A paper describes a structure:
Drug efflux pumps play important roles in intrinsic or acquired drug resistance to a wide variety of currently available antimicrobial agents. AcrAB-TolC is a RND-based tripartite efflux pump, comprised of the outer membrane protein TolC, the periplasmic membrane fusion protein AcrA, and the inner membrane transporter AcrB, which cycles through three different conformational states during the drug transport process: access (L), binding (T) and extrusion (O). A small peptide, AcrZ, has been identified that modifies the activity of AcrB. In this study, we report the near-atomic resolution cryoEM structures of the AcrAB-TolC pump captured in both resting and drug transport states.
The structure of disulfide-bond stabilized AcrAB-TolC pump with closed channel at 6.5 Å resolution. We also have developed a new procedure to stabilize the full pump using disulphide-linkages that were chosen from the proximity of residues S273 in the β-barrel domain of AcrA and S258 in the β-hairpin motif of the DN subdomain of AcrB seen in the cryo-EM structure of the full pump. The full pump assembly, stabilized through the disulfide-bond linked AcrAB, was imaged in the absence of ligand. The reconstruction of the apo pump at 6.5 Å resolution revealed TolC to be in the closed conformational state, like that seen in the crystal structure of the isolated protein. The periplasmic component of the pump, AcrA, forms a hexamer through the trimerization of two conformationally distinct protomers. A gap is present at the interfaces between adjacent AcrA dimer pairs, so that the AcrA helical hairpin, lipoyl and β-barrel domains do not pack tightly to seal the channel from the periplasm. This gap must be closed in the transport process to prevent leakage of substrates into the periplasm. In the ‘closed state’ conformation, seen in the apo pump, the constriction is maintained by an inter-protomer hydrogen-bonding network, involving R367 in one subunit and T152, D153 and Y362 in the adjacent subunit. The quasi six-fold symmetry of the interface between AcrA helical hairpin and open-state TolC reduces to three-fold symmetry in the apo-form. We propose that the apo-form of the pump with a closed TolC represents a resting state, while the pump assemblies with opened TolC in the presence of transportable ligands represent transport states, in which the AcrB trimer adopts asymmetric LLT, LTT or LTO conformations.
Author numbering:
A (entry chain C), B (entry chain A), C (entry chain B): 1 to 428
Amino acid sequence: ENLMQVYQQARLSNPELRKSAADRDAAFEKINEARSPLLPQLGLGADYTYSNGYRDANGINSNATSASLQLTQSIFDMSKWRALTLQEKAAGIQDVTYQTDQQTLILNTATAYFNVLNAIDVLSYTQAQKEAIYRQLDQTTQRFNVGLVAITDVQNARAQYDTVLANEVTARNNLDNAVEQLRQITGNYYPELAALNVENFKTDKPQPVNALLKEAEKRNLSLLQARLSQDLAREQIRQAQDGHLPTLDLTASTGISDTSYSGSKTRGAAGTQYDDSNMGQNKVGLSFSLPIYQGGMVNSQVKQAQYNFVGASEQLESAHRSVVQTVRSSFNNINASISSINAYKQAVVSAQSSLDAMEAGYSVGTRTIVDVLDATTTLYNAKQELANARYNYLINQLNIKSALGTLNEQDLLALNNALSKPVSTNPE
Amino acid sequence: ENLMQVYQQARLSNPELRKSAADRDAAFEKINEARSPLLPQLGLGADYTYSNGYRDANGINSNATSASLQLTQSIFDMSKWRALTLQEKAAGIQDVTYQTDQQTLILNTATAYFNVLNAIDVLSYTQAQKEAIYRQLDQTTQRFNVGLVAITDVQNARAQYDTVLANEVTARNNLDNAVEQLRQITGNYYPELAALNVENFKTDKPQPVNALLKEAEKRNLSLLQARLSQDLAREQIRQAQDGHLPTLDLTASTGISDTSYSGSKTRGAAGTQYDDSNMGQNKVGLSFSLPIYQGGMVNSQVKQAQYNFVGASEQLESAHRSVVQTVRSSFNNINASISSINAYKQAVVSAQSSLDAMEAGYSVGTRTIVDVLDATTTLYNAKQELANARYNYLINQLNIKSALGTLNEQDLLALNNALSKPVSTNPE
Amino acid sequence: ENLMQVYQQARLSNPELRKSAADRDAAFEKINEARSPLLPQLGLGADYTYSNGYRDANGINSNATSASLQLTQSIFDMSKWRALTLQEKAAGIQDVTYQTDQQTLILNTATAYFNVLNAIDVLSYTQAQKEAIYRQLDQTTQRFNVGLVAITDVQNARAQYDTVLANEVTARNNLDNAVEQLRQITGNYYPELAALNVENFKTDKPQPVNALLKEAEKRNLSLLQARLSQDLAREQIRQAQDGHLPTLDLTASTGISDTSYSGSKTRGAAGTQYDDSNMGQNKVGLSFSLPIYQGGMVNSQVKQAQYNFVGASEQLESAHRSVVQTVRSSFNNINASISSINAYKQAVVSAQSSLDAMEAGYSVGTRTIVDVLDATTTLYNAKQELANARYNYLINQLNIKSALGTLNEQDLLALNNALSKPVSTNPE
């Protein structure tokens, strides 16, 4: 119903908080399995092989069988540690985006909630606006019952009556789709929700803009994430340089072999050479290798990981201009939002007393009923400008606080405290 | 010209019926090559090797040369069955979306055909609207030829005349880009196309909404496709468990070797050891391997494909709310569509006789010619939006029928039967 | 400030000429490392192995430290050559895209420049339109100070006055976001920019349309890029058939081993066999292998790069209809741009003298001040449509000429010479 509970009814029932929770727990499980090649390895083998000779080798035969246990452990790696560093940068990026999944969750779930309530309230001034068109249409037709005016005012109020019928029909459809927004993110139908107390509405002034360069350049998730990808490109420089490294190896392998004998050249002149033994063997191993001449494959990957480093530096420049653009664009959205809201209050008041002055001008007949529906219509327009711009002001609150990246569930909770009384969803 | 034949022109010359047909034949051809590693493998080998010795090998020399023939066969795999049924669930995903390429083909080619008809007919009422502004403009200027009215009526209707000139200009460009719907999608041009019999139109009432929960959840391609990816993820759990499995191996080979002899310590005190033989060899092979200790990537992708199992479960939840959203949103689109059609029919009536009583109201002079052009313009809005209420209702027909997944070339054919008389595609 | 210098201040400061030049130098550096497997490859090895027996084999022990020098060279490949010429189709398609990055960067730096100019000019027309609303509003209120008019034009002009306040507020915001377009792309702030000398602006007639099928089908980067992807797919057909090729291989190695001895059953009846001195060894090798029976993986990839052959062939059909769509759509955008501009100039003249004859009709009182603000409003609409349609005209020059792919820094310079005097950003 109200905000944070629907957030609860989103935080349990967002398929992308559960999908993305599956992403981040898959990413930390991915840290676990990226750690998994660091372990030793153990396995068994066995084989059977027949032999036969010819071409100055015919007459001697054999069959051979063996088994072997093998456990290995590396005596050099930086790459699993490297891919563990890129692994933790990557799952840390997944936590950055996952904070953008709770941040996006509150952002578009609360935003979508404001679209639901927005379709309720714009649909509501559509309703009362239709009521005004039907009152002046109705009393106009009543003046036609004695025969005062030509029918085209009645039928222009009928055609525009069909227009506001299309507005409550299609805006009714927009609220149906808004029920598919709470049914898209939340999943269900709520017959009423928490509306807005428009009475205590105030003009909160935002932060200084270069202070928001500090808030953005300190508190962005995105170019932080470009530092993770960019330093990750430095780890790809050093990972090609892991491509330049020598190595040592540890292995272990026991095994058995019998290798029975057969053939014409085998039996005869054997002399204890061809007697059957029961061979058992225990083995250990090491292996050094050095990169003498790779052919220069590394120092191409170094340069291209520098190209990812400076390109990702241009993703901190892209993200720099982008979230500079977010807090400054959003900043001016708050500015023209607030000042435009002041114009909406004076437009509502001047449209109200001007509406009543059109009631005066129509009571004396200097202006027709057309201007009555123009100050009426324009009045309801300014009603949706002010109230809907309160919703867009709420979106502006999500622009500043979500642009901060520190939008918690308590900013979400305070915006739940901004709410008020429940209003139904499907009237007639 | 008519619908389905252009669909035939789509079914021959959609580059994604052809290219995506090639994608689905790439998927089934990929079932063939996904089956291909299961087959035995036969190949050749040959090598030349020289030896030279020093320091306990100084004076003994040799060289080596061998040939070989190798056919192998696996005596375990289950992963190629899930390469193969990844390949068949996912080839069936390509058939899901390729049935959504005929469904998308009819969808956006018939939709785009309705955009061509939309540009022709909205542009046509733009033409006749310009004719109305030119009859009252020309008639008003004709009454100015004796000097009845003010010139600002003639020049306001010259600015509005330039406006409807601009509307037939850029809506002429929408006809040009509609020729780029026929030419972007169909590839070609028609001088005229089969329009809509708008005169016999009726309001069909759609299905019950929960019957479309059963019907939509019955014949969705998308979350069926998520079940393909999702049981696919279940055998990625069980394909990490294919990594948990032991194995047996079959190989086969044969070869020849000569190994001529040379050197100072070689010849002398040989004693039949260094006589030349020309060894021939036949070999078979089997190999077992045992998952004794595998580092713990074991069971990790079990967990991560549980995050893909719940992942595609939230893609069947996302797809669930998405196609519930599609047929319910589309349902309300048909509702406000039909009721809006009623609104525009009453707008045709009320704007019609209201326009005629503005001809009366202007013949008496109580209203100016401005209101005549406004009820005229509004009447053409009831024309373009009753006719485009029919056209968006045709899009609504593709919203229900394409949202069902039941759409075929016979629903396509029935919408070709809905067509009528051809109207030209380049008038003046 | 003036155009191409901003481009200069965008060419050094494009994150995607730096990013994407880093991509293309990554592609050329990837020609280098794509050549690096073709090089002879040299490296070192060293290892050590202990022996111990049991089960009728107990009592034998030995050890050997081997070092090895290994240089290899292939005596068949076409794949690294086709990786290298897929690296020339990748560096060459990457050059197609990077010419589309200079091309697209000029396209959107000049486009975005026109958007900044658009926000400035529409903002200024909002300014002077507000000035007209305040002159007639103020004069109207002063006529109420003697008592001539009704207050509903004063307060409806306060609703419209607050409206144009909200329009210089939100168009002030479009200015601010346009500063975030110069700060999004240029990255910085400019105090003023080059306004257009609109006085010498004239219409230029475009090229013949089938001649633009020659210029487009000759001078597309995109379906050229589909040709490179397409012959790329032709030697993916024949790179599968490179998978059908037999092959020969050259290897080289040497090194030492030590092979000392220990044990209980080792010692006893040695006879010069168990004397310790440390071996040296030299080796080479070859490998010729033939696709005798491979399971038929190839001839599926052949058909699927026929599916990629019709992939990029129906991307040359998709790209064909797309750039036919680009220059025909853009062509008719030039046409409706020109004729619409002519309608805008006649809207300027007819709305101007119509506005003056509404000043006559209001000075005599036959029409109210509402029509004065409608011809005023519509006049400023002809201003914004006119100069903004000059931005539509020049942006159509970017559409057709960037559609030719020969839109260069000199067409950038030509439109830089189309500029004139600078106007600042932020007055009151």
